[PDB]
Design a protein around this ligand. Structure first.
Ligand SMILES: [Zn+2]
Length: 46
C-alpha cells in the first residue's frame, strides 16, 4: 500500500532529463539515448 523506492544517498550520473540516476557512466549513456532524437519534451530542455 504505502511503499516505494527505498535507497539512501542518491546515486551519481543523475539523468538531467527525467531524474534516473546511475553509478556507471555507461549505464547513463545507454539511458540518455531515449532522451535524444525527438523534440525535447518539457520546458526543462535547452
Ligand atoms: Zn532519463
Amino acid at each position: 500500500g504505502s511503499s516505494g523506492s527505498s535507497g539512501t544517498g542518491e546515486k551519481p550520473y543523475e539523468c538531467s532529463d527525467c531524474g534516473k540516476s546511475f553509478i556507471k557512466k555507461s549505464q547513463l549513456h545507454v539511458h540518455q539515448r531515449i532522451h535524444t532524437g525527438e523534440n525535447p519534451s518539457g520546458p526543462s530542455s535547452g
